[PDB]
Amino acid sequence: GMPGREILVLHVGQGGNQIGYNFWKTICEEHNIDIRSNQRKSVEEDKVDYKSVFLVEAPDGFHPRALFIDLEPLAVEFLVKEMKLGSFFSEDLMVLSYSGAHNVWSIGYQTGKKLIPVILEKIRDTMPETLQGFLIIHTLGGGTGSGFGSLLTETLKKEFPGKGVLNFSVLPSEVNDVTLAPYNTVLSLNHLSRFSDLVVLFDNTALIRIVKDLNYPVIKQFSDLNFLIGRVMASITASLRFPGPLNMDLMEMAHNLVALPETKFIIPSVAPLTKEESEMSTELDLVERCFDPTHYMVNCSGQGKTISSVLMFRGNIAIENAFSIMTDIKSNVAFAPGVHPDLGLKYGICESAPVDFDKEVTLLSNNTIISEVFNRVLERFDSLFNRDWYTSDYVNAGTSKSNLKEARDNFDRIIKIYKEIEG
Ligand SMILES: Nc1nc2c(ncn2[C@@H]2O[C@H](COP(=O)(O)OP(=O)(O)O)[C@@H](O)[C@H]2O)c(=O)[nH]1
């Protein structure tokens, strides 16, 4: 392996760790590595491969440069026992507790604070000095992924200010989720806005909606939603893992999207999503679908105004078709007022292809429509907070109702900043 551009992935909470199954299986397969054996799949290899960004090449084989962190052992049992991948998800990478968070952001933040010294100790003793930053994968509706996840985002940014903190954060289902989810989401999004460098948001609602609206993208609960999430957040890391015009590090990835410091929440969009749709689709259809608010990984009523946008062509793409397609797509994309006609969209081609598809198009967008998504989160927060509903356990866990209001008001400040850019 060649030193540099090493990323440490931190899976926090049950959802974040369960997503790691297909996140690491996709990364392993796309780099010709078998997750069961920790070895390569074939002697066939590209001359240049940036597998060292997410994978450690030990003499025995390849291991994930990752920590699997949870206040309960249920998710790691899914990985080691149900998935039988204990050789890859090994115990030296596991920071585990057994108290739990009980779906309360505050309990995850407080209980996880007792695990921070051992986490920082493992990072210094095991990570390389050329480590470029951290990638935090977690959900926002619970307590461990939200509270401990907010703590790790904050702690890593403070202890490693020169490194990048990237967050792949999963939003709760708007219509079917725990009652404490709006409190946990607002608390987590407030912490992430302060300490994260880039927050790419995923919504279980959006993924469910695509199946419900038939090629079948989920056939079993969670085990296919998380399967699909892990493949998407692995697809949007291809810029960090493969050479090409859009080859980036974590800092570059945030700079291409974060115009103002408060505008750090990104909507990802990937096409194709199923093998049937891939066989019967073209490059133009995948791009037009990525700009379609239906295929947004966040649930959006319509498209908004684009501030900054990064699109990637993966696989067998004709570069002249890519040039001609993006000229026509840019004319029909609504950009935020003040964005230069040729400065709001970046496209690139990656030769490496996803395992299941010959082609793939990914879109990362800093879009003003996230204010609409955040306003729905805000109105669900206010429907409960203004009646003092479900607030008793945040109080007992060290988060006052005043602190809940502070995170809400700052969360609303982010919405209004996005809305001003929209005009
Ligand atoms: N999309 C998706 N959401 C999940 C998954 N696991 C948990 N969640 C979501 O996370 C929210 C509650 O957080 P959870 O991770 O279960 O509890 P935690 O252990 O305190 O982080 C709920 O809205 C769930 O929908 C998962 O595998 N996929």
- CA dist., res. 144 & res. 97, Å (int): 11
Cβ of 139 less than 6 Å from ligand 1:
yes
Contact 17, 68 (CB under 8 A): yes
Cβ of 15 less than 6 Å from ligand 1:
yes
Calculate how far, in angstroms, residue 147's C-alpha sits from the geometric centre of ligand 1: 13
Residue 5 β-bridge partners: none
CA 115, 171, 89: angle at the middle one, nearest 5?
A: 45
Question: Got the DSSP string for 337-406?
Answer: TT--TTSSEEEEEES---SS-SEEEEEEEEETTHHHHHHHHHHHHHHHHTTTTT-HHHHHTT--HHHHHH
What DSSP state is assigned to residue 334? P
Experimental method: X-ray
Cβ of 204 less than 6 Å from ligand 1:
yes
What DSSP state is assigned to residue 37? T
Q: Which atom of ligand 1 is closest in space to residue 108's alpha carbon? A: 20
Calculate how far, in angstroms, residue 263's C-alpha sits from the geometric centre of ligand 1: 25
Contacts of 159 (CB under 8 A, 6+ apart): 120
Q: Whose CA is nearest to atom 5 of ligand 1?
A: 15
What DSSP state is assigned to residue 147? I
Cβ of 177 less than 6 Å from ligand 1:
yes
Residue 315 β-bridge partners: 359
- Ligand 1 mutation pick, 70, 204, 229, 298, max ligand atoms within 8 A of CB: 204
Q: Which residue has the tokens 């005009």?
A: 423
Q: Whose CA is nearest to atom 26 of ligand 1?
A: 15
Record the tokens describing residue 349, joined without a space. Answer: 């081609």
Question: Got the DSSP string for 87-140?
Answer: TTS-GGGEEE-SS--TT-HHHHHHHHHTTHHHHHHHHHHHS-TTEEEEEEEEES
Q: Which residue has the tokens 């989160």?
A: 377
User: How crowded is the C-beta side of 39, counted as CA atoms within 13 Å?
Assistant: 6
Q: Whose CA is nearest to atom 13 of ligand 1?
A: 142
Cβ of 111 less than 6 Å from ligand 1:
no
- CA dist., res. 129 & res. 367, Å (int): 35
In order of 41, 52, 122, 245, the CA distances from 128 in angstroms are 26, 11, 11, 26
- CA dist., res. 168 & res. 163, Å (int): 16
- How do the residues of the chain divide into helix, strand and coil, expressed in percent and rounded to 5? 45, 20, 35
Cβ of 185 less than 6 Å from ligand 1:
no
Record the tokens describing residue 326, joined without a space. Answer: 């993006």
Resolution in A: 2.5
- Delimit the domains of the chain by residue range: 1-266, 267-369, 370-423
In order of 33, 170, 256, 307, the CA distances from 204 in angstroms are 29, 7, 26, 24
Give the residue from 146, 321, 379, 351 showing the smallest Cα distance to 244.
351
Calculate how far, in angstroms, residue 202's C-alpha sits from the geometric centre of ligand 1: 12
Cβ of 170 less than 6 Å from ligand 1:
yes
Q: Which atom of ligand 1 is closest in space to residue 172's alpha carbon? A: 23
Cβ of 226 less than 6 Å from ligand 1:
yes
Calculate how far, in angstroms, residue 271's C-alpha sits from the geometric centre of ligand 1: 24
Cβ of 222 less than 6 Å from ligand 1:
yes
Residue 349 buriedness (CB in 10 A; 0-12 / 13-18 / 19+) = middle
- CA dist., res. 268 & res. 113, Å (int): 31
